[PDB]
Amino acid sequence: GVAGVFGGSLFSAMHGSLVTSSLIRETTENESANAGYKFGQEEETYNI
Amino acid sequence: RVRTVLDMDRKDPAKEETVKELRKDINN
Amino acid sequence: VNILGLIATALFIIIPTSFLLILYVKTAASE
Amino acid sequence: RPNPNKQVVELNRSSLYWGLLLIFVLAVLFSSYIFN
Amino acid sequence: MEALVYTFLLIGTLGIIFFSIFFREPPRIA
Amino acid sequence: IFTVRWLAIHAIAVPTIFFLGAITAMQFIQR
Amino acid sequence: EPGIVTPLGTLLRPLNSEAGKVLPGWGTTVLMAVAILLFAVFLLIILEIYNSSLILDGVTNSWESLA
Amino acid sequence: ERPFSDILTSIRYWVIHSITVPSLFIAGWLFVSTGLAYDVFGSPRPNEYFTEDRQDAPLITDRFNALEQVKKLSAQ
Amino acid sequence: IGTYQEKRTWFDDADDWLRQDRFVFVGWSGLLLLPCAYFAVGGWLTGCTFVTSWYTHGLASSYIEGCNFLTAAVSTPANSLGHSLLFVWGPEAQGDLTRWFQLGGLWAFVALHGAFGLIGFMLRQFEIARSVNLRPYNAIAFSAPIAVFVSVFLIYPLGQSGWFFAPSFGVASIFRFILFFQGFHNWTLNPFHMMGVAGVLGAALLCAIHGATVENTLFEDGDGANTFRAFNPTQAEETYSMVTANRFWSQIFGVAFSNKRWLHFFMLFVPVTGLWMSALGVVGLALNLRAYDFVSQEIRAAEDPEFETFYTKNILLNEGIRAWMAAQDQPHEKLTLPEEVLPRGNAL
Amino acid sequence: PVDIDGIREPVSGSLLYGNNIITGAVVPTSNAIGLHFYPIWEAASLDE
Amino acid sequence: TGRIPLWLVGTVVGLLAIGLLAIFFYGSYVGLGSSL
Amino acid sequence: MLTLKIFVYTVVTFFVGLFIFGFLSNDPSRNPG
Amino acid sequence: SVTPSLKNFLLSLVAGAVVLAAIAGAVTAVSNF
Amino acid sequence: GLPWYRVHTVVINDPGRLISVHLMHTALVAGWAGAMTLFEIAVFDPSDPVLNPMWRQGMFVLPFLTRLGVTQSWGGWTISGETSSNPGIWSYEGAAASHIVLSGLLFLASVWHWVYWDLELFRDPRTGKTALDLPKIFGIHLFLAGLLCFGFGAFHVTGVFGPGIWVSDPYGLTGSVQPVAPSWGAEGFDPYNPGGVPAHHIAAGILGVLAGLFHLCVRPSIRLYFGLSMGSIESVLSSSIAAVFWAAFVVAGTMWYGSAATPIELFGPTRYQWDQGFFQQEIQKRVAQSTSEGLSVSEAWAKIPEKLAFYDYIGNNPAKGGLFRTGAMNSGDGIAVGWLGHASFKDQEGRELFVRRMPTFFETFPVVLIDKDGVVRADVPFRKAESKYSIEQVGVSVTFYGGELNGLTFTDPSTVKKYARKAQLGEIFEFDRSTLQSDGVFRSSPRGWFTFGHLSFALLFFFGHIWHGSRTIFRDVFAGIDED
Numbered sequence A: 001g002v003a004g005v006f007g008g009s010l011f012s013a014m015h016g017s018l019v020t021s022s023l024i025r026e027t028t029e030n031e032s033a034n035a036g037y038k039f040g041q042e043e044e045t046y047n048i
Numbered sequence B: 001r002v003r004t005v006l007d008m009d010r011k012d013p014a015k016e017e018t019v020k021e022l023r024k025d026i027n028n
Numbered sequence C: 001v002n003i004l005g006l007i008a009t010a011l012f013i014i015i016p017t018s019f020l021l022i023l024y025v026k027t028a029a030s031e
Numbered sequence D: 001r002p003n004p005n006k007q008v009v010e011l012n013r014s015s016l017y018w019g020l021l022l023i024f025v026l027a028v029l030f031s032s033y034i035f036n
Numbered sequence E: 001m002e003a004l005v006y007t008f009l010l011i012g013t014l015g016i017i018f019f020s021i022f023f024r025e026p027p028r029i030a
Numbered sequence F: 001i002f003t004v005r006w007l008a009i010h011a012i013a014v015p016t017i018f019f020l021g022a023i024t025a026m027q028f029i030q031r
Numbered sequence G: 001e002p003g004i005v006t007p008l009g010t011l012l013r014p015l016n017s018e019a020g021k022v023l024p025g026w027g028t029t030v031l032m033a034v035a036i037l038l039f040a041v042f043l044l045i046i047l048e049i050y051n052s053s054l055i056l057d058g059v060t061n062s063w064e065s066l067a
Numbered sequence H: 001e002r003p004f005s006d007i008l009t010s011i012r013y014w015v016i017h018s019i020t021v022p023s024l025f026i027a028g029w030l031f032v033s034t035g036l037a038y039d040v041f042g043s044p045r046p047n048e049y050f051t052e053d054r055q056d057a058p059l060i061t062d063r064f065n066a067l068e069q070v071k072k073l074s075a076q
Numbered sequence I: 001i002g003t004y005q006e007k008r009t010w011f012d013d014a015d016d017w018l019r020q021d022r023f024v025f026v027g028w029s030g031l032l033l034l035p036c037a038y039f040a041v042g043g044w045l046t047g048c049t050f051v052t053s054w055y056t057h058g059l060a061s062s063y064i065e066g067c068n069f070l071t072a073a074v075s076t077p078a079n080s081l082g083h084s085l086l087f088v089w090g091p092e093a094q095g096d097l098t099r100w101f102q103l104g105g106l107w108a109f110v111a112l113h114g115a116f117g118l119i120g121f122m123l124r125q126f127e128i129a130r131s132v133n134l135r136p137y138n139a140i141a142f143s144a145p146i147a148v149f150v151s152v153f154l155i156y157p158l159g160q161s162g163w164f165f166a167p168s169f170g171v172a173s174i175f176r177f178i179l180f181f182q183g184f185h186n187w188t189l190n191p192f193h194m195m196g197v198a199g200v201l202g203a204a205l206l207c208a209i210h211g212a213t214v215e216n217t218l219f220e221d222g223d224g225a226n227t228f229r230a231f232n233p234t235q236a237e238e239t240y241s242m243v244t245a246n247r248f249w250s251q252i253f254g255v256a257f258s259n260k261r262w263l264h265f266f267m268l269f270v271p272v273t274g275l276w277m278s279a280l281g282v283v284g285l286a287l288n289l290r291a292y293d294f295v296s297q298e299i300r301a302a303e304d305p306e307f308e309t310f311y312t313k314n315i316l317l318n319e320g321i322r323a324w325m326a327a328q329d330q331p332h333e334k335l336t337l338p339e340e341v342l343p344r345g346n347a348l
Numbered sequence J: 001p002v003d004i005d006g007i008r009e010p011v012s013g014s015l016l017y018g019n020n021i022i023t024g025a026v027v028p029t030s031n032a033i034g035l036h037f038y039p040i041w042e043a044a045s046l047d048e
Numbered sequence K: 001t002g003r004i005p006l007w008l009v010g011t012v013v014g015l016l017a018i019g020l021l022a023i024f025f026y027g028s029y030v031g032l033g034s035s036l
Numbered sequence L: 001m002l003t004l005k006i007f008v009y010t011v012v013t014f015f016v017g018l019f020i021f022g023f024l025s026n027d028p029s030r031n032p033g
Numbered sequence M: 001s002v003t004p005s006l007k008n009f010l011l012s013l014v015a016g017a018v019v020l021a022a023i024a025g026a027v028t029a030v031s032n033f
Numbered sequence N: 001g002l003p004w005y006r007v008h009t010v011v012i013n014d015p016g017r018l019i020s021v022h023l024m025h026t027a028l029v030a031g032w033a034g035a036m037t038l039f040e041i042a043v044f045d046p047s048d049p050v051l052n053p054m055w056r057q058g059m060f061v062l063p064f065l066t067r068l069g070v071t072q073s074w075g076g077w078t079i080s081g082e083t084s085s086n087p088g089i090w091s092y093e094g095a096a097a098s099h100i101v102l103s104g105l106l107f108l109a110s111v112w113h114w115v116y117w118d119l120e121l122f123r124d125p126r127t128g129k130t131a132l133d134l135p136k137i138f139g140i141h142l143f144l145a146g147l148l149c150f151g152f153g154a155f156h157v158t159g160v161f162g163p164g165i166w167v168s169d170p171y172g173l174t175g176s177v178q179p180v181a182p183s184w185g186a187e188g189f190d191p192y193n194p195g196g197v198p199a200h201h202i203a204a205g206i207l208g209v210l211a212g213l214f215h216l217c218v219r220p221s222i223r224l225y226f227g228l229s230m231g232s233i234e235s236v237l238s239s240s241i242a243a244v245f246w247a248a249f250v251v252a253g254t255m256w257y258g259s260a261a262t263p264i265e266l267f268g269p270t271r272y273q274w275d276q277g278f279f280q281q282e283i284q285k286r287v288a289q290s291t292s293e294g295l296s297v298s299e300a301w302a303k304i305p306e307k308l309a310f311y312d313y314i315g316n317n318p319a320k321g322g323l324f325r326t327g328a329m330n331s332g333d334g335i336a337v338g339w340l341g342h343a344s345f346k347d348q349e350g351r352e353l354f355v356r357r358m359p360t361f362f363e364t365f366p367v368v369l370i371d372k373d374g375v376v377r378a379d380v381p382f383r384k385a386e387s388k389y390s391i392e393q394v395g396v397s398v399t400f401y402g403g404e405l406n407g408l409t410f411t412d413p414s415t416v417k418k419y420a421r422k423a424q425l426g427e428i429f430e431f432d433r434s435t436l437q438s439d440g441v442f443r444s445s446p447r448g449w450f451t452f453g454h455l456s457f458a459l460l461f462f463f464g465h466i467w468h469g470s471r472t473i474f475r476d477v478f479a480g481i482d483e484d
């Protein structure tokens, strides 16, 4: 169980960081990058 | 004239971690 | 802590809440 | 003459809810210790 | 009086949860 | 061969086998 | 717009005038490395003395030094 | 770099390693059995934990001269 | 570089060699990571195999002594050595490698090499991210484990009387460290371990929920009952329906993500914040600024002999832990407590 | 307060009885009950 | 390099690993660390 | 206390009956597919 | 020098310089092949 | 549409408003210094320098003001306990007023440098765009810093022009602001040697000037210029954050372990003085020396200063405290009034018994009275049934030498148990707790609070180094990435 929660934290951080880093440039500076993604984008906004 | 042996034997009961005990401990 | 802790808790509740509400109202009025 | 670096801060409602929740949860957590 | 403060804080948290559930900003598709 | 991958494999293999032999020998000690 | 001209600004212009000027190659990076090396050794000596891993002849490293 | 499957399925790799992997294993077994491990890493043998006068666990209790203290506390 | 590349220098050759995409990327950070990490792990294995703690903690903590993987541990040195760095050439070991092992210098060796290995690994993450042109969010995330390691294995022992109270590198030794923290510092009651627990449990919750939701909102994209084959690494369309997931969690839970970037940033954010808060709490404990007691309840219990809460029972448990563990956990104290002074319940 | 251990030593767990959020709790059922089912209508009064 | 199929190598290595683990458990029940 | 018991029995029976007879009323055909 | 610990410290500096130069020379030799 | 956590980036590319905001932070810091000094002076009790010094009352800026030379006050009282004949303008109130007026002046200057942001000084003479020559700026400001460091080391602390710094005896009994002679030998690196502080601040300062003259004359090389991202202000921010958290770690370590710059007469004792019996050994050595002179025990203990005994008390240990045990040390434990004396415990046989002192780790510690040979002879048992080393069973009596109870012997078991429990904490003192309504739990001394605060800041600023430096190196991709 300890290995599971530590692995959950590790893999959550790892996956979130990888997806956030791979997030393709659809929004420039002067605003948050979250504006680049749209709820109906129906496409991968990150370079897997 | 201070008896160093008695000084150490007084500090040890109250506090065994005193630097008096640990200094030159292998000599004892 | 009868009063000093009470004042600390009240300020910690009030100041950030007022800041956030003011920012949200300004945002909603501007856009 | 006006400063070109002027920008406007924005705060959507989800951010407002997150901030209020953070403030009140921190108050809940630390109020027991503050009153001691 | 401490109980009053704790109850107020819990009520505030629950009210914030209620507003965030039933008065959320609609998720805008595209 | 003796490439970087060769060194990376053998830095964790030779000590590993030596220690496995050591631990196996330890398994048959009488106090 | 041209900006604001003030006596202090005119006085201090030369200090900020040559912005971006560099030297070809690595320049004085080798001397920088030597200085960094010596500083690391110096900090190591100081940490050793304070940690008592480096006993010195005239250094007591204790409150008795106040005497 | 050759794929691992090609190397691990190659007869040459196995004939090379079948005299070295057992050699390392036997080296480790000899290292433990011949008493070298105790000699170099200083872990006391099962009959060396307690001396004639020290019938309890040892205590370093000294910052400097700790070499002499641990030497006299260890098995002689 | 910018205006021109000038001439190729020996640094250029070294960079070109180190930056090659071989099986094991070394890079410039490798020169610090590989030796330090290799020596740290090898030192832990040698210590858990051959090195003992008979002279440091008066405990047998190696395989050759009869310990297993659970109970073997590279124990921290004796308390009388204080915060000595315990160099193998230092004034303690004075060059005797065997005695340096006996004095516990292997713990300092492993800890320092591991700290520099963690520095090298974050440097490796930065270097690799820069090579592939990605925002180095994973190095920023890995800052949290570095903070935990620094605050627990370095800051905390330095705040105490010596390395002796650091966590010894082992399983049962870590468990001893945990129980010691509960008994002495009342670490559970500390709001910073509370925030750390919340962060770690929330991170595990997010991992499980995101995995399940993605695996249960997949688009068909294939005719086989094995849904893993119906995916191409280079495809552009999302493999799962974000709209369906948002609707499902909105109607089940009340609120739901509507932004993939925000979702994954939240997944990154929760555990890092939890670990950083726990690290701040551990610093506070290093100074013994423990959130041990609520003085109001202690005063009320002292005045009122019938007022009892779970907090007071926890205080009694901590008292028992301290009294019954002090004698053997801290041999340097030489605590020969008679059995009549140890706190104890009834008929137990 | 609730006599959790069944030794007639009640434990206070509510805010009104001098507890904060950290120490407050809903005390488990009395040890005298054991695994017995204890609905409201089983007790003689709300106080019990 | 098709000789000595990879599945055979894997099976033999796994058998050796399981045997080593069993030897370790046996040593856990006898000799040093056996509580007798 | 008897009145409370009979009231709770009525409530529980009502809700459990709703559950049982709602999952029987052609539930598997209530999917979009 | 005066203190044995100082002599050991200086020898440690020399040894660390030796290993660092060994790493640098190794990377240079492999880079130039 | 800047998010709330990016608003203060508006001045990233505006040098004038950067000056303005940095002026505002400086003004706020100076105002805090002045206001904190005023509050501390208002709530400070200067009557009793012994048994009630600054570190007992929770003073935080008074230790630093006293350390650097400011000792007197306009109220007629001196921190050393004498009378203020002429405190001058550099009293505590003077320092507070000066920092306050400086805060106001910096506020006005911040307003001005904010309104007139578009100064031609910040324009690149060639291109006409706004730019800052960061290498030259660092050279200038480093030259200034080195000049000031040398000036402080050579004139201040040495007393050539300044007043000196706080120098004390090893046991913190007689300390005062004195000029310090520089230590140019190896002993200048003894952390507890005061003479290192001038010499260092001299030599280092000199180097700074020379270093300035280099980083002001010699332009950085192109490879180094692009490698270290010189020309981006955020690179400077990353490097500065790193340096500042390094310095925070150093100062936290040097205060927790104590040094010549953090005397115990201003911040209180360290926990390592209690752990190693720094004061207990000295007290017993003085007692033994007096006994060897032929004096009785009562006279030998009466010769012990009360301040030295007060240091030998676990309530003054900085590591006996709580995170939310707030306020002055007097708020937890009462205000010290006097020294009861030294308690000597003796069994009915006449064998002298010593009470085992509470280690710093233990919130509660059982009472054990130990023979000279480390053999437990008595205790306050937890199980009074079939006890073996009970006070009544062994017949322990306590005689007090010196202090308030001088030559007084108590034999009733209740009083002996009470005094043994008190003596497990160190020297026994009388405390007046009614004045401040002390609850009865130990607080932490100002050195503990300083170390905790600056260590937490050091960790957070390590994360700051990481974040702002990652933003520096990856500036091109931190606006987004173009896939691979």
Ligand code: CLA
Residues within 6 Å of the ligand: N004, N005, N006, N007, N008, N009, N012, N237, N241, N460, N461, N462, N463, N464, N465, N467, N468, N471
């Ligand atoms: C002197 C050091 C320093 C300086 C000059 C800056 C400057 C900056 N930071 Mg940075 N940072 C620092 C240290 C510093 N930081 C440290 C130590 C950390 C680790 C905690 C961070 C972590 C950090 C993050 C994660 C981010 C920045 C960002 C930024 C930029 C925008 C800041 C902003 O507008 O937020 C606005 C601030 C507020 C709206 C108020 C927040 C209130 C806080 C939570 C509590 C109030 C503190 C209290 C009043 C003052 C006490 C602090 C003092 C005792 C130290 C800005 C140029 C942002 C950026 O990258 O720009 C794009 C951003 O994302 N910083």
Ligand code: CLA
Residues within 6 Å of the ligand: C008, C009, C012, D026, D027, D030, D031, D034, N032, N039, N040, N043, N057, N058, N059, N060, N323, N324, N325, N326, N327, N328, N445, N446, N449, N450, N451, N453, N454
């Ligand atoms: C690092 C800087 C620093 C340090 C080391 C100190 C240290 C000290 N201060 Mg001080 N102070 C500071 C900055 C600092 N202060 C600043 C910036 C101000 C201006 C506001 C003050 C104003 C001030 C006053 C008015 C007083 C002190 C006092 C004291 C002394 C009492 C001990 C104490 O702090 O109680 C305990 C400290 C704490 C419990 C703070 C814990 C920090 C927690 C973890 C923050 C978490 C907040 C949380 C996230 C939010 C939720 C809480 C919410 C429910 C309210 C002590 C030596 C007192 C004194 O001795 O009188 C002379 C006193 O009355 N200070």
Ligand SMILES: C=Cc1c(C)c2cc3nc(c4c5[nH]c(cc6nc(cc1[nH]2)C(C)=C6CC)c(C)c5C(=O)[C@@H]4C(=O)OC)[C@@H](CCC(=O)OC/C=C(\C)CCC[C@H](C)CCC[C@H](C)CCCC(C)C)[C@@H]3C
Residues within 6 Å of the ligand: A006, A009, A010, A013, A014, I036, I037, I038, I040, I041, I044, I110, I111, I113, I114, I115, I116, I117, I118, I121, I125, I138, I139, I141, I142, I144, I145, I149, I168, I169, I170, I171, I174, I271, I272, I275
């Ligand atoms: C016990 C918990 C725990 C472990 C064991 C662990 C382990 C690891 N995490 C890594 C990564 C990460 N961890 C991350 C977030 C987290 N990690 C967490 C918790 C853990 N993470 C948590 C809670 C989070 C959330 C914040 C991130 C974001 C990353 C990565 O990017 C990275 C990765 O790629 O993962 C796949 C790997 C890279 C480490 C490495 O090779 O360094 C180099 C080797 C070194 C430094 C030598 C180790 C020396 C150590 C420090 C001291 C000696 C330790 C002994 C050898 C072992 C003692 C064992 C006993 C105590 C039982 C490694 C497998």
Ligand SMILES: CCCCCCCCCCCCCCCC(=O)OC[C@H](COP(=O)(O)OC[C@@H](O)CO)OC(=O)CCCCCCCCCCCCCCC
Residues within 6 Å of the ligand: A034, D012, D014, D015, D017, D018, D021, D028, E010, E013, E014, E017, E020, E021, I252, I253, I254, I255, I256, I257, I258, I259, I262
């Ligand atoms: C039927 C069961 C009903 C009970 C469920 C209760 C639901 C709780 C929802 C509250 C969320 C509060 C945040 C609002 C803000 C909010 O939710 O905005 C909605 C947000 C989705 O927003 P977006 O995806 O548009 O976010 C992107 C934005 O940055 C702008 O694009 O969802 C989330 O952020 C994650 C969901 C919250 C994760 C769970 C929250 C856990 C907190 C629990 C608090 C415990 C208190 C205990 C009482 C003392």
Ligand SMILES: CC1=C(/C=C/C(C)=C/C=C/C(C)=C/C=C/C=C(C)/C=C/C=C(C)/C=C/C2=C(C)CCCC2(C)C)C(C)(C)CCC1
Residues within 6 Å of the ligand: F011, F012, F015, F016, F019, F020, I038, I039, I041, I042, I043, I045, I046, K017, K018, K020, K021
């Ligand atoms: C300390 C020191 C050093 C170093 C050393 C080293 C680096 C070593 C290495 C070492 C090593 C590197 C070792 C290894 C080990 C390994 C092992 C010991 C193995 C383990 C494994 C196992 C036990 C298995 C398990 C299992 C089975 C049986 C079944 C299935 C599953 C699994 C696989 C899990 C030096 C020189 C610096 C000098 C000084 C001191």
Ligand SMILES: CC1=C(/C=C/C(C)=C/C=C/C(C)=C/C=C/C=C(C)/C=C/C=C(C)/C=C/C2=C(C)CCCC2(C)C)C(C)(C)CCC1
Residues within 6 Å of the ligand: K007, K010, K011, K013, K014, K015, K016, K018
């Ligand atoms: C997991 C896995 C693996 C594997 C591993 C291993 C190690 C295996 C083994 C296996 C095995 C190794 C198995 C075995 C089998 C056997 C059997 C199945 C037999 C049976 C028998 C019977 C049934 C009968 C008996 C009898 C009796 C009853 C009586 C008398 C007579 C006799 C004895 C005959 C691999 C790599 C592939 C990969 C994938 C995964």
Ligand SMILES: CC1=C(/C=C/C(C)=C/C=C/C(C)=C/C=C/C=C(C)/C=C/C=C(C)/C=C/C2=C(C)CCCC2(C)C)C(C)(C)CCC1
Residues within 6 Å of the ligand: N028, N029, N031, N032, N035, N100, N101, N102, N103, N104, N105, N107, N108
């Ligand atoms: C305008 C002007 C003036 C002046 C006035 C005045 C009177 C000023 C003052 C002002 C002031 C009077 C200032 C002060 C400030 C303060 C500060 C700036 C502080 C703050 C605080 C903080 C920031 C803290 C935070 C925290 C807490 C609360 C809790 C724990 C943690 C911590 C510590 C972080 C004159 C006349 C010269 C004339 C000219 C103009």
Ligand SMILES: [Fe+2]
Residues within 6 Å of the ligand: A019
């Ligand atoms: Fe994902």
